[PDB]
Amino acid sequence: SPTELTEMRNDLFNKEKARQLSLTPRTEKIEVKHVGKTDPGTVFVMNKNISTPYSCAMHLSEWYCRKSILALVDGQPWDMYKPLTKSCEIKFLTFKDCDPGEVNKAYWRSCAMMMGCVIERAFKDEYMVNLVRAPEVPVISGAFCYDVVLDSKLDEWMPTKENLRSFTKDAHALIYKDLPFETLEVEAKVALEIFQHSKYKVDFIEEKASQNPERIVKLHRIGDFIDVSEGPLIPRTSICFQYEVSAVHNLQPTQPSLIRRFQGVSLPVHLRAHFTIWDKLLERSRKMVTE
């Protein structure tokens, strides 16, 4: 069953993380030094596998907890709920910085992530889904995409406007629950055993395992739903204020494998948009992405 398959993945993910923090020793300590233009000189005595940068920011001030989306660990981004495993340097960054591009790219992956969640959970339940991935696109794309393939009986049919509006209110319900992105570092042998059915996720994991020398891959869970991402993601779902799907298009090799790909646009709470400027961004996202 597709429902029992979902809890089957969530159980194994609980088996995997339980092995992680049970394997790591207890009462471990690490001295992480703060770096940045604001409040320098501080160093936090933190744990190795239960502490997180969000906990570090909460020791400092909740103003950063509300504004921090990622952190730089020795010159590379980091997920706010992923535990730092050694003494290092840390710096939180926000949307309004000199180079917030890595924060946008994480948001681009984040908003691209749970778009796949709501659409394949919304299905009209007898139909199946064989989703592929969340394709990476630059900031200038103007919209976040997500490829998908579907049965052949509804190949000619495309989702209508009321079907789009159904996904939007569902996505609005997901963010209202304030779902946090629970991440985990897993092995390729493990991740393939979670997605052993969907072939498109299988070869995607071998692709990531081939790119990685040690074949270790990171994984992010959206509540019951799970999916892979190339880069880090935003801490919470609630920080994306307005969020909706623009249009749908379908790519020439259709019959061997149909390439459907939805498209939307959104932005955070820290900079909310007005009705007028938001409207011209819709018809921008309704168009097709060339890539």
């Binding site: 009462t27 300590k29 320098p40 000189g41 160093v43 936090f44 744990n47 502490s51 020791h59």
Partner: protein, 214 residues
């Protein structure tokens, strides 16, 4: 700043002179610290000097009462019986032992003794201490105990009551010989640097950097 403020404030006084003198029961600090390794004639004189003040005094049985006083003095910290602890513990050893445990309880059980407690050295004071003398004994102790401190609201600060762990300490005792009612009481610890640090605390902390003004 005390003397300078007294000048500027104008609270002039003469030196406090009186026939009465403040009588102590323990010398502050120590006379000679045993530098432990990485793992004598003066001792026998100090041993037999204690015998000149109290002929009924032994050395072979001292490590027994030392460990006996150790476990019961710490059991008093659990019960929080300050009266018995004061007669069993010096006035220099009391604040460093009983200050930080305020606003919290403590649990300390004794499992066993791996090795027997052994005297390391014996030192002694001069006559120029308020017309009194004070002797000191050092004893190494290698045992296994449990420690679990709970704060005001009953959540463990660190340590678990079930697991014991090995520990090594060099306890320091001292006694007032001028009067006869003096008894051996814990004074201080050497806390050498080469020894390893204890278990960390499960909670995480920070430090505020230098508050830079404009």
């Amino acid at each position: 700043f005390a003397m300078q403020h007294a000048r500027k404030a104008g609270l002039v006084i003469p030196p406090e002179k009186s026939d009465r003198s403040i009588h102590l029961a323990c010398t502050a600090g120590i006379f000679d610290a045993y530098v432990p390794p990485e793992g004598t004639m003066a001792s026998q004189v100090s041993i037999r000097r204690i015998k000149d003040y109290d002929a009924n005094f032994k050395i072979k049985d001292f490590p027994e009462k030392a460990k006996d006083i150790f476990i019961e003095a710490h059991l008093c910290l659990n019960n929080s019986d300050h009266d018995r602890l004061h007669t069993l513990v010096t006035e220099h050893c009391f604040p460093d032992m009983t200050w930080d445990i305020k606003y919290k309880t403590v649990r300390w059980s004794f499992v066993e003794s791996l090795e027997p407690s052994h005297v390391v050295q014996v030192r002694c004071s001069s006559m120029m201490n308020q017309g009194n003398v004070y002797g000191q004994i050092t004893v190494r102790m290698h045992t296994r105990q449990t420690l679990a401190i709970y704060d005001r609201f009953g959540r463990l600060m660190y340590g678990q009551e079930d697991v014991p762990k090995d520990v090594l300490e060099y306890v320091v005792f001292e006694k007032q010989l001028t009067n006869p009612y003096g008894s051996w009481r814990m004074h201080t610890k050497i806390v050498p640097p080469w020894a390893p640090p204890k278990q960390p605390i499960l909670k995480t902390v920070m430090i505020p950097g230098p508050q830079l003004k404009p």
